[PDB]
Design an enzyme around this catalytic site. Structure first.
Site, mmCIF file in Angstrom:
data_model
loop_
_atom_site.group_PDB
_atom_site.id
_atom_site.type_symbol
_atom_site.label_atom_id
_atom_site.label_comp_id
_atom_site.label_asym_id
_atom_site.label_seq_id
_atom_site.Cartn_x
_atom_site.Cartn_y
_atom_site.Cartn_z
ATOM 1 N N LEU A 177 22.854 4.112 -4.921
ATOM 2 C CA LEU A 177 22.567 3.509 -3.619
ATOM 3 C C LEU A 177 23.796 3.442 -2.727
ATOM 4 O O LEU A 177 23.700 3.618 -1.510
ATOM 5 C CB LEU A 177 21.987 2.101 -3.785
ATOM 6 N N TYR B 241 -4.854 4.542 6.912
ATOM 7 C CA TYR B 241 -3.635 4.157 6.201
ATOM 8 C C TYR B 241 -3.449 5.038 4.966
ATOM 9 O O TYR B 241 -2.326 5.378 4.599
ATOM 10 C CB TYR B 241 -3.672 2.678 5.795
ATOM 11 N N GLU C 31 26.092 5.549 -2.455
ATOM 12 C CA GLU C 31 26.349 6.842 -1.831
ATOM 13 C C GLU C 31 25.536 7.039 -0.543
ATOM 14 O O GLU C 31 25.973 7.759 0.361
ATOM 15 C CB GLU C 31 26.069 7.980 -2.814
ATOM 16 N N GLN D 187 0.822 -1.209 0.000
ATOM 17 C CA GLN D 187 0.000 0.000 0.000
ATOM 18 C C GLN D 187 0.860 1.264 0.000
ATOM 19 O O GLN D 187 0.512 2.266 -0.636
ATOM 20 C CB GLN D 187 -0.970 -0.017 1.187
ATOM 21 N N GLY E 64 3.899 -7.221 10.601
ATOM 22 C CA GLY E 64 3.153 -8.266 9.921
ATOM 23 C C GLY E 64 3.966 -9.543 9.773
ATOM 24 O O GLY E 64 5.187 -9.522 9.845
ATOM 25 N N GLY E 65 3.290 -10.667 9.572
ATOM 26 C CA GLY E 65 3.985 -11.934 9.436
ATOM 27 C C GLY E 65 4.728 -12.002 8.115
ATOM 28 O O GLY E 65 5.801 -12.596 8.027
ATOM 29 N N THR F 57 -2.356 -4.176 14.506
ATOM 30 C CA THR F 57 -3.349 -5.235 14.362
ATOM 31 C C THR F 57 -2.935 -6.557 15.019
ATOM 32 O O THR F 57 -3.658 -7.554 14.918
ATOM 33 C CB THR F 57 -3.656 -5.493 12.871
ATOM 34 N N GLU G 119 3.549 -8.054 17.456
ATOM 35 C CA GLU G 119 4.428 -7.307 16.556
ATOM 36 C C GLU G 119 5.846 -7.033 17.121
ATOM 37 O O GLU G 119 6.814 -7.026 16.353
ATOM 38 C CB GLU G 119 3.738 -6.008 16.130
HETATM 39 N N1 LIG Z 1 1.875 3.027 7.525
HETATM 40 C C1 LIG Z 1 1.187 1.910 7.190
HETATM 41 N N2 LIG Z 1 1.233 0.864 8.045
HETATM 42 C C2 LIG Z 1 0.565 -0.274 7.757
HETATM 43 C C3 LIG Z 1 -0.206 -0.380 6.523
HETATM 44 N N3 LIG Z 1 -0.757 -1.612 6.502
HETATM 45 C C4 LIG Z 1 -0.358 -2.245 7.634
HETATM 46 N N4 LIG Z 1 0.424 -1.433 8.378
HETATM 47 C C5 LIG Z 1 1.074 -1.765 9.655
HETATM 48 O O1 LIG Z 1 1.772 -2.998 9.436
HETATM 49 C C6 LIG Z 1 1.654 -3.829 10.597
HETATM 50 C C7 LIG Z 1 0.866 -5.062 10.190
HETATM 51 O O2 LIG Z 1 1.595 -5.659 9.124
HETATM 52 P P1 LIG Z 1 0.958 -5.893 7.681
HETATM 53 O O3 LIG Z 1 1.891 -5.293 6.646
HETATM 54 O O4 LIG Z 1 -0.499 -5.518 7.645
HETATM 55 O O5 LIG Z 1 1.111 -7.514 7.642
HETATM 56 P P2 LIG Z 1 1.559 -8.393 6.367
HETATM 57 O O6 LIG Z 1 2.972 -7.986 5.991
HETATM 58 O O7 LIG Z 1 0.520 -8.351 5.296
HETATM 59 O O8 LIG Z 1 1.674 -9.883 7.006
HETATM 60 P P3 LIG Z 1 0.438 -10.931 7.264
HETATM 61 O O9 LIG Z 1 -0.829 -10.186 6.924
HETATM 62 O O10 LIG Z 1 0.649 -11.274 8.702
HETATM 63 O O11 LIG Z 1 0.745 -12.052 6.301
HETATM 64 C C8 LIG Z 1 0.872 -3.032 11.623
HETATM 65 O O12 LIG Z 1 1.823 -2.351 12.453
HETATM 66 C C9 LIG Z 1 0.096 -2.040 10.781
HETATM 67 O O13 LIG Z 1 -0.223 -0.851 11.505
HETATM 68 C C10 LIG Z 1 -0.201 0.805 5.641
HETATM 69 O O14 LIG Z 1 -0.843 0.795 4.571
HETATM 70 N N5 LIG Z 1 0.502 1.875 6.034
#
Ligand SMILES: Nc1nc2c(ncn2[C@@H]2O[C@H](COP(=O)(O)OP(=O)(O)OP(=O)(O)O)[C@@H](O)[C@H]2O)c(=O)[nH]1
Ligand SMILES: C=C/C=C\[C@H](C)[C@H](OC(N)=O)[C@@H](C)[C@H](O)[C@@H](C)C/C(C)=C\[C@H](C)[C@@H](O)[C@@H](C)/C=C\[C@@H](O)C[C@@H]1OC(=O)[C@H](C)[C@@H](O)[C@H]1C
Ligand SMILES: Nc1ncnc2c1ncn2[C@@H]1O[C@H](COP(=O)(O)OP(=O)(O)CP(=O)(O)O)[C@@H](O)[C@H]1O
Ligand SMILES: Nc1nc2c(ncn2[C@@H]2O[C@H](COP(=O)(O)OP(=O)(O)O)[C@@H](O)[C@H]2O)c(=O)[nH]1
Ligand SMILES: [Ca+2]
Ligand SMILES: [Ca+2]
Ligand SMILES: [Ca+2]
Ligand SMILES: [Mg+2]
Ligand SMILES: [Mg+2]
Ligand SMILES: [Mg+2]
Lengths: 441, 354, 426, 54
Positions: free
Chosen positions: A252, A224, A254, A15, A143-144, A179, A183
Site C-alpha cells: 500500500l 447497480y 508504494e 454491493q 449516502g449517510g 437517491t 449528496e
Molecule cells: N456504483 C454504485 N453506486 C451506488 C450503489 N448503491 C448506492 N450507490 C450510490 O451511492 C449513493 C447513495 O449512497 P448509499 O451507499 O446507497 O447510502 P448508504 O451508505 O447506505 O447510507 P444510508 O442509506 O443513507 O444510511 C448514491 O449516489 C447512489 O447512486 C452501488 O451498488 N453501486
C-alpha cells in the site's frame, strides 16, 4: 507477505464489495465454498493471494473483509448469496435503521453507537495478521452511512492503527442514479473530515460508469449490478499488484510513493480499456497501441474531465493479458507525438508499467466480453479537480439558502461544520490550481 | 424549444447572435445561472468549462474553445510558434519575436540582444516594437536600451517584435494598414473563413523618421479616431473593405486580393489552428465548443503577409455584424441544434500528399 | 421491517382510510379476511410495512380507527373490508364533535385521546423498527381536525424521534358541510406546521373539479372524491410498500422533499384521469404530461403561480425506464424556470413494476411547490371574513377557548404564507 | 526514452520508462466531539418536550 483488510461501508460499499470478492475468487480459482484446489499448502501460507485471503485448517479461504451497514437488507444479501459460505457472521455488521442520506446521522447519531463494535470486528481480523499493511475502504460519498460513518471510521483507524496505510474507493454522486438531493453536502462533509486520514483515494463518478455501460455495453438503462461489475474490474486491476507476484505497487505504501507526491492531492484518475459487450457477435481484438491510446480518452475515464488542461504528477500503466514491454514503449512513443501530456516541472515525464500476463477475468454470463489484453491507467492529474469544482458549486447553491441544513443541525452537527468543510474544499481547489495552472479586440 | 444563457453582456457579436436566436421563436433564453441550457454564450474570463457537459439529457455547446488562449495572448503566441515543430523558430510568416519579462519578476532577453547586436553590426534595419496584452501601451524604437527599459517600468510580460519597416502603403495618402479576418471554428473543427474582411487603415502618411508620433504607425481603430486629424478622410471610419482593396490591387499593382494576399492568409489561419487542434478539439468530449477568432495581418511592400496576432473575442465591423452573426447561427449553432446560399464562409481545408 | 402505524380519525378520515386499505389490500393480494391470495413475491416483500402477521398466516392492517361518534366506524365495520381490521383498534366515543375543533382538541377529544394512545402504544411495541405514523383526516370538521391534531401532539411527545406524516383534506366553500370550516382548518394548520414532517394537501374543490370537469361525473359524491384520494394515496405510498431505491422510507423521503422544516406541505397528483376511450393504451409521454398537468393535481393551486422546491414522481407498470428518464428530463428541461435553480437535481423519479388494479400503467406526482401558498391564502381570507365580526365564535368560546388563540392561529398561517413567498422570489 | 528497473517473473513483468527528466485527533478529542453533538441533540429534544409540556 503483508495482509490487507478490506472495509465495505453502506449500500454502495457493500454491493461493490460483493462484486469485487466474487471476481477475486474467480481470478484466484477459489470456489463459492471457499476451497482452492490449486493451493497446495492446506491451512496456511504466505503467498501473494494470502494478502486478501486467510485460510482455515479445513482449507477454507476467507476474505480479510468487514461489511458494515446501518440497515440490514443489503448485507442480508451477502449472508444469503452465492458466496455466503465465504464469510462468517463476525465479518458482517448491520444496524436496524440507516442514516437517511444524512451525514450527521451517520457520523454523530448512529456512528457513535456502532463504531466500537466495528473496531472490535476489525481488531479480530488484524489479530490474524502477521504484518498488517493497512486498509482498503469502499463507500459512497452520497449516502449517510457511506459519508458519515466512513469519516468516523477513518479517524478512529488513524488512532488505533497509526502506522497503517489507508486507501479509499469512493463513489462520487451522479443525479442519473442518485437517491438524495443532499449528496453534495454529504460528499463535501466526508471529504473534509477524511482528507487527512486517507493516503490515496480512487474516485469513481457514477456518471462515467453509467455512460460507459450505455455506450460500450449497449445497456439502455444500467443497473447497480451492471455498474458494479465494471467497477470491480477496475478495482481488481488496481489491487492485482497486491494479490499476484510482481514488482510494482506490491504494497500500500508504494501506491502513495508512486502516485501521490503531494499528500492532500491524493486522488488519482483511473482510465480503463477496453470495455466490450459480450453480446457483440463480431469483435476485432484491440492491440496494445489501441488500448493504450484509449487511456487518454475522457470517454474511458472513471471521472469525466480533461487532462489536456491540467498537469500530471505521476502515471502508472497496469496491463493484464498478452502484453510485452516492447509494444508498450512503441505505443507510448507514438502517443506522446500526438497527445497533450504535460507533467509538472518538478516531476519526470514518464510511466511506471506493470504487466500481468493473465488477461482480465470476466463473470460468467456477465456484460463484459473476454479480451486478449486490457489496461488500467492511474494518473495523478490536476484535471480531476473539475469534479471538486462541480461538487462545490452545487454545495454553494443550496447552502446559500441553508436548504436542508436543519436536518444536519437536528442531529447535533453545528452549522459551522458546513462552512469549515467548504473552506477546506476551497483550499483543495486552490492547491490543484497552483500545481496545475501557470475584450472588444 | 432550445435553451441558452448569456454570460458576457459586453459582447456585440453575441448580443446580435442572442437577438437572432430569440427571433427564430425556437430558442428560449434562461437566467444566466440556470444549468439546464443547450447553449452557453460564455464569459471571457474564467469560463467554467469544468461544469459543462454534465447535464443528463442535454447536449451542451459553448462559444469558446478551452485552451485557445495559447493563440490569443501575445506572449503565448510567440512561445507556441517557437516551440511547435509544425510552426517552428524558422516560421516565415511571423515576425522575429521575443518574450521579455520585466526585471522585477524562460526570458529571452540575451537571445534578443544577440540578434539585435547582429543587425546593428550588419547595417541592417533595426527597429523593434514592444507590446503586451495588458494594454488598451506600445513603444517603437531602434534602440534596444529604450525598449528594455520601457518594459521594466511596467509589471507584466511583454513581447519585443521586429517592426515591419517596409509596409504596403495605400495611395493616395501613403498610409499604413492591417487586415482583420474573422474565422469560425465549429464543433467538428471545420475552419470557416468569413468571406468579408476589413482593412483598418491609418489616415496619416507613413513616416519612418519619426516613431515618436505613433498615429501613422498604429492602425488601431480607436487610436485613429482619437489622435488622427484626418479620420474618415479617405474611407468611412478608416475601414476599407475587400471589394475596394481588390480593385485597388488590380488598378495599382496588376494583381488580385485572392492571389497576392488571401492565399497566404488562408495558409496562416489553417497552420495556426491545425497546430493546436489536438490540445483543444472537443471531438470526443462530453461538451462541445465553437469559437469566433479575429486574425490580424500586416502586408509588406513585397506583398508578403505577416501574422500580427489572433483575437479570441473579436468585435465586427458595423456593416458586417448582421451577415456574420447570421453565419454563426447557421454553421455553429443550428448545425448542433437544427431548427424546425452560397455560404458566406470559405471552408479552409487542404490535403497535399507526401 | 420498517413498520408504519396508520391512524384514521373522524368521518372524512375513516371513509378515505377505509377506501385506502381496500385499495392497497387488493394490490398486496390480501382478501377481506386477511388471507393472502396473490401470485407474486413482490406483494409480500414489504407487506410488513403496513400489515402485521397474525396466526394462520393472516395479515392485519397496522391501523387504528378513531372517532368521537360511532356511525362512520359502524359503516366501516359493515363495509367491504371491514372485518380485516383489528377489532380492538376501533376507538370511539358517543357524543360527537359537532364540526368543532375545540370539541375535538380540548373537551370531547381530551376525554378519548388516552385510550387511542394506548392502542397506538400496543401497535408500536410490537414493531421491530417503527418508522413513524401516517394520519388520515379532514381539517374542516371537529374530530379529524381537532382531535387528530391533539393526537399528533401527544404522539410527538411520546415518540419524538419518529416521522409524522398526514393526508389532510382541506375544506372548500364549494364542497362544504358547515360555515366554520375555515376556523377549524386555520387552527389545525398551525398544529401541522409545527408537528408533522410531511403533509399531503388534498383540496376538496380540486377533487370535485376533477370529477366534474375531467371525469365527466355530473354529480360527484364524497364516494367519488374518496376513490380519487385512495388512488392517490396508493401511488404516493408505492415507494414505501414495494422494493425500491428512492424514498423507500418516511425519513429518506422527508430529507429529499423538505428543505425547510415548516415548508412540508405537498401537492399530490395522479394519472391517468380518464372518463368512461378508457381502454386506450397510455404512453409514458402522455403519463408524464398529465402527471404534471395542473388539472391532475389536488391542491387547487396553480403550479405556474409558484416554483417547485422539490418533486417526487412515481411511475407504475411495465414500461421503458429509458423513456421515463427521457420524459422526466424533458419536463424539467422545457419548463426549468418553474424549478428553483438553487436546489440542483430536485426532481427524483421512481419506477415500480406493479401497476394499480385494472391499469397497465400509472403515475403519481408529489410536489413541494411554493404555489401551495394560494391554498393557505384562501383559507386565511375565509377565516378573516368571519373573524373580523367574531361570527360563530361562541361555538368555540363555549368550549373554553378565547379569541386570542384565533388571533395567534391567524398570524401563524399568514407567517407561513409569507415564508413561501420569500422562496418564490429567491 | 530510457527503460529502467525491468523486473521479470513467471506471472508477468514491470518496468519504468522516462521520456524526460524533471527541472491527528486523539481518541479523547473524537470522544468529546461525539458527546458534544449528543448533548446538542439532548438540549433540542429537552426544549421540544418543554414546549409540549406548556
Ligand atoms: N456504483 C454504485 N453506486 C451506488 C450503489 N448503491 C448506492 N450507490 C450510490 O451511492 C449513493 C447513495 O449512497 P448509499 O451507499 O446507497 O447510502 P448508504 O451508505 O447506505 O447510507 P444510508 O442509506 O443513507 O444510511 C448514491 O449516489 C447512489 O447512486 C452501488 O451498488 N453501486
Ligand atoms: C370515473 C372513471 C372511472 C374509470 C376510468 C375509466 C379509469 O379506469 C381505467 N381502467 O382506465 C380510472 C383510472 C379513472 O381515471 C380514475 C380517475 C377513477 C378513480 C380513481 C376514481 C373515480 C373518481 C371513482 O368514481 C371510482 C369509483 C371509479 C372507478 C375506479 O374503480 C377505477 C379504479 O380505481 C382505482 O383505485 C385504481 C386506480 C384502478 O383500479 C382504477 C381502474
Ligand atoms: N511587428 C509589427 N510591425 C509593424 N507594425 C506593427 C507590428 N506590431 C504591431 N504593429 C501595429 O500596431 C498595431 C497594434 O498591434 P497589435 O495587434 O500587436 O496590438 P493590439 O491587439 O492592441 C491591436 P489589434 O489586435 O486590434 O490588431 C497593429 O494594427 C499594427 O498596425
Ligand atoms: N373528500 C372527503 N371529504 C369529506 C368527507 N366527509 C367529510 N368531508 C369533508 O370534511 C370536512 C368535515 O369534516 P368531517 O371529517 O366530516 O368531521 P369530523 O368527523 O368531525 O372529523 C368538510 O370539509 C367536508 O367537506 C369524505 O368522505 N371525503
Ligand atoms: Ca495455503
Ligand atoms: Ca495517517
Ligand atoms: Ca364527556
Ligand atoms: Mg443504506
Ligand atoms: Mg488585440
Ligand atoms: Mg361530517
Amino acid at each position: 507477505m503483508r495482509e490487507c483488510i478490506s472495509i465495505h461501508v453502506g449500500q454502495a460499499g457493500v454491493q461493490i464489495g460483493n462484486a469485487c470478492w466474487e471476481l477475486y475468487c474467480l481470478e484466484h480459482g477459489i470456489q463459492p465454498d471457499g476451497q482452492m484446489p490449486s493451493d497446495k499448502t492446506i491451512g496456511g501460507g504466505d503467498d501473494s493471494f494470502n494478502t486478501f485471503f486467510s485460510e482455515t485448517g479445513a482449507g477454507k479461504h476467507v476474505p480479510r473483509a468487514v461489511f458494515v451497514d446501518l440497515e440490514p437488507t443489503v448485507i442480508d444479501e451477502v449472508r444469503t448469496g452465492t458466496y455466503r459460505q465465504l464469510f462468517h457472521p463476525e465479518q458482517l455488521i448491520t444496524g436496524k435503521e440507516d442514516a437517511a442520506n444524512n451525514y450527521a446521522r451517520g457520523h454523530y447519531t448512529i456512528g457513535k453507537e456502532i463504531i466500537d463494535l466495528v473496531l472490535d470486528r476489525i481488531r479480530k481480523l488484524a489479530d490474524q495478521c502477521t504484518g498488517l499493511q493497512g486498509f482498503l475502504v469502499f463507500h459512497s460519498f452520497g449516502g449517510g452511512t457511506g459519508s458519515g460513518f466512513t469519516s468516523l471510521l477513518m479517524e478512529r483507524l488513524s488512532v488505533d492503527y497509526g502506522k497503517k496505510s489507508k486507501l479509499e474507493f469512493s463513489i462520487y454522486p451522479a443525479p442519473q442514479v442518485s437517491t438524495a438531493v443532499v449528496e453534495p453536502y454529504n460528499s463535501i462533509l466526508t471529504t473534509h473530515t477524511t482528507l487527512e486520514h486517507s493516503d490515496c483515494a480512487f474516485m469513481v463518478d457514477n456518471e462515467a460508469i453509467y455512460d460507459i455501460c450505455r455506450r460500450n455495453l449497449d445497456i439502455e438503462r444500467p443497473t447497480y449490478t451492471n455498474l458494479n461489475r465494471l467497477i470491480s474490474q477496475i478495482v481488481s486491476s488496481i489491487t492485482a499488484s497486491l494479490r499476484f507476484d510482481g514488482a510494482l505497487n506490491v504494497d500500500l505504501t508504494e501506491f502513495q510513493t508512486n502516485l501521490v507526491p503531494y499528500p492532500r492531492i491524493h486522488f488519482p484518475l483511473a482510465t480503463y480499456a477496453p470495455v466490450i459487450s459480450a453480446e457483440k457477435a463480431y469483435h476485432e481484438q484491440l492491440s496494445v497501441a489501441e488500448i493504450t491510446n484509449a487511456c487518454f480518452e475522457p470517454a474511458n475515464q472513471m471521472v469525466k474531465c480533461d487532462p489536456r488542461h491540467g498537469k500530471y504528477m505521476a502515471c502508472c500503466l497496469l496491463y493484464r493479458g498478452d502484453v510485452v514491454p516492447k509494444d508498450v514503449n512503441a505505443a507510448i512513443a507514438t502517443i506522446k507525438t500526438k497527445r497533450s501530456i504535460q507533467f509538472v516541472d518538478w516531476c519526470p515525464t514518464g510511466f511506471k508499467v506493470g504487466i500481468n500476463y493473465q488477461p482480465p477475468t470476466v463473470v460468467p454470463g456477465g456484460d463484459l466480453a473476454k479480451v486478449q489484453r486490457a489496461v488500467c491507467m492511474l494518473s495523478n492529474t490536476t484535471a480531476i479537480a473539475e469534479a471538486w469544482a462541480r461538487l462545490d458549486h452545487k454545495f454553494d447553491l443550496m447552502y446559500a439558502k441553508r436548504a436542508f441544513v436543519h436536518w444536519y443541525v437536528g442531529e447535533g452537527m453545528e452549522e459551522g461544520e458546513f462552512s469549515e468543510a467548504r473552506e477546506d474544499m476551497a483550499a483543495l481547489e486552490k492547491d490543484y490550481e497552483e500545481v496545475g495552472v501557470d475584450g472588444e479586440e | 424549444m432550445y435553451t441558452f444563457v448569456v454570460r458576457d453582456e459586453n459582447s456585440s457579436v453575441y448580443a446580435e447572435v442572442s437577438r437572432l436566436l430569440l427571433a427564430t421563436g425556437q430558442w428560449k433564453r434562461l437566467r444566466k445561472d440556470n444549468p439546464r441550457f443547450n447553449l452557453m454564450l460564455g464569459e471571457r474570463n474564467r469560463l467554467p468549462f469544468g461544469r459543462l457537459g454534465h447535464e443528463p439529457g442535454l447536449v451542451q455547446l459553448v462559444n469558446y474553445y478551452r485552451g485557445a488562449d495559447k493563440l490569443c495572448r501575445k506572449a503565448s503566441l510567440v512561445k507556441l510558434i517557437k516551440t511547435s515543430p509544425e510552426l517552428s523558430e524558422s516560421c516565415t510568416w511571423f515576425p522575429e519575436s521575443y518574450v521579455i519579462y520585466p526585471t522585477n519578476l524562460t526570458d529571452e532577453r540575451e537571445v534578443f540582444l544577440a540578434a539585435y547586436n547582429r543587425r546593428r553590426e550588419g547595417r541592417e534595419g533595426n527597429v523593434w516594437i514592444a507590446k503586451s496584452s495588458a494594454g488598451a501601451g506600445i513603444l517603437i524604437s531602434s534602440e534596444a536600451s529604450e525598449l528594455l527599459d520601457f518594459i521594466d517600468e511596467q509589471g507584466q510580460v511583454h513581447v519585443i517584435q521586429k517592426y515591419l519597416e517596409k509596409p504596403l502603403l495605400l495611395e493616395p495618402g501613403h498610409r499604413k494598414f492591417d487586415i482583420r479576418s474573422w474565422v469560425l471554428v465549429d464543433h467538428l473543427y471545420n475552419i470557416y473563413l468569413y468571406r468579408e474582411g476589413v482593412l483598418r487603415t491609418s489616415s496619416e502618411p507613413y513616416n519612418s523618421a519619426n516613431f515618436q508620433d505613433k498615429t501613422c504607425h498604429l492602425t488601431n481603430h480607436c487610436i485613429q479616431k482619437e489622435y488622427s486629424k484626418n479620420y474618415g478622410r479617405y474611407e468611412e471610419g478608416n475601414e476599407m473593405f475587400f471589394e475596394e482593396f481588390n480593385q485597388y490591387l488590380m488598378d495599382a499593382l496588376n494583381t488580385t486580393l485572392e492571389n497576392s494576399i488571401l492565399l497566404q492568409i488562408k495558409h496562416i489561419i489553417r497552420s495556426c489552428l491545425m497546430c493546436i487542434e489536438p490540445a483543444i478539439s472537443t471531438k470526443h468530449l462530453h461538451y462541445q465548443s465553437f469559437q469566433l477568432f479575429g486574425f490580424d495581418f500586416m502586408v509588406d511592400e513585397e506583398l508578403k503577409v505577416w501574422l500580427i496576432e489572433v483575437n479570441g473575442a473579436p468585435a465586427c465591423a458595423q456593416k458586417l455584424y448582421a451577415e456574420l452573426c447570421q453565419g454563426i447561427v447557421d454553421v455553429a449553432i443550428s448545425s448542433v441544434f437544427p431548427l424546425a446560399p452560397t455560404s458566406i464562409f470559405i471552408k479552409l481545408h487542404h490535403h497535399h500528399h507526401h | 421491517m420498517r413498520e408504519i402505524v396508520h391512524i384514521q380519525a373522524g368521518q372524512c378520515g375513516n371513509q378515505i382510510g377505509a377506501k385506502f386499505w381496500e385499495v392497497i389490500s387488493d394490490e398486496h393480494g390480501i382478501d377481506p379476511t386477511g388471507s393472502y391470495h396473490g401470485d407474486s413475491d413482490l406483494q409480500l416483500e414489504r407487506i410488513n410495512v403496513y400489515y402485521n402477521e397474525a396466526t394462520g398466516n393472516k395479515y392485519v392492517p397496522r391501523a387504528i380507527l378513531v372517532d368521537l361518534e360511532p356511525g362512520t366506524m359502524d359503516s366501516v365495520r359493515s363495509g367491504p373490508f371491514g372485518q380485516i381490521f383489528r377489532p380492538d383498534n376501533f376507538v370511539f366515543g358517543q357524543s360527537g364533535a359537532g364540526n368543532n375543533w375545540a370539541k375535538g382538541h380540548y373537551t370531547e377529544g381530551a376525554e378519548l385521546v388516552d385510550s387511542v394512545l394506548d392502542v397506538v402504544r400496543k401497535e408500536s411495541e410490537s414493531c421491530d423498527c417503527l418508522q413513524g405514523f401516517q394520519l388520515t383526516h379532514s381539517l374542516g370538521g371537529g374530530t379529524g381536525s381537532g382531535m387528530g391534531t391533539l393526537l399528533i401532539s401527544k404522539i410527538r411527545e411520546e415518540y419524538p424521534d419518529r416521522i409524522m406524516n398526514t393526508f389532510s383534506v382541506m375544506p372548500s366553500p364549494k364542497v362544504s358541510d358547515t360555515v366554520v370550516e375555515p376556523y377549524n382548518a386555520t387552527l389545525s394548520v398551525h398544529q401541522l406546521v409545527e408537528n408533522t414532517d410531511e403533509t399531503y394537501c388534498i383540496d376538496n374543490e380540486a377533487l370535485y373539479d376533477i370529477c366534474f370537469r375531467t371525469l365527466k361525473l355530473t354529480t360527484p359524491t364524497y364516494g367519488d372524491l374518496n376513490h380519487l384520494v385512495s388512488a392517490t394515496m396508493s401511488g404516493v405510498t408505492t415507494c414505501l410498500r414495494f422494493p425500491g431505491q428512492l424514498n423507500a422510507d418516511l425519513r429518506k423521503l422527508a430529507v429529499n422533499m423538505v428543505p425547510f422544516p415548516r415548508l412540508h406541505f405537498f401537492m399530490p397528483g395522479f394519472a391517468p384521469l380518464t372518463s368512461r376511450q378508457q381502454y386506450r393504451a397510455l404512453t409514458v409521454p402522455e403519463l408524464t404530461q398529465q402527471m404534471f398537468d395542473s388539472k391532475n393535481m389536488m391542491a387547487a393551486c396553480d403550479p405556474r403561480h409558484g416554483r417547485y422546491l422539490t418533486v417526487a414522481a412515481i411511475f407504475r407498470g411495465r414500461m421503458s425506464m429509458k423513456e421515463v428518464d427521457e420524459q422526466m428530463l424533458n419536463v424539467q428541461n422545457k419548463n426549468s424556470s418553474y424549478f428553483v435553480e438553487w436546489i440542483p437535481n430536485n426532481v427524483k423519479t421512481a419506477v415500480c413494476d406493479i401497476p394499480p388494479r385494472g391499469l397497465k400503467m400509472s403515475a403519481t406526482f408529489i410536489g413541494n411547490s411554493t404555489a401551495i401558498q394560494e391554498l393557505f391564502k384562501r383559507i386565511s381570507e375565509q377565516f378573516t371574513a368571519m373573524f373580523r365580526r367574531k361570527a360563530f365564535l361562541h361555538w368555540y368560546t363555549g368550549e373554553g377557548m378565547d379569541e386570542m388563540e384565533f388571533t395567534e392561529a391567524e398570524s401563524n398561517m399568514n407567517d407561513l404564507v409569507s415564508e413561501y413567498q420569500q422562496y418564490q422570489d429567491a | 526514452m530510457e527503460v529502467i528497473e525491468l523486473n521479470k517473473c513467471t506471472s508477468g513483468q514491470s518496468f519504468e520508462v522516462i521520456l524526460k527528466p524533471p527541472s491527528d485527533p486523539s481518541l479523547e478529542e473524537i470522544q468529546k466531539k461525539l458527546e458534544a453533538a449528543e448533548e446538542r441533540r439532548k438540549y433540542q429534544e429537552a426544549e421540544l418536550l418543554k414546549h409540549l409540556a406548556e
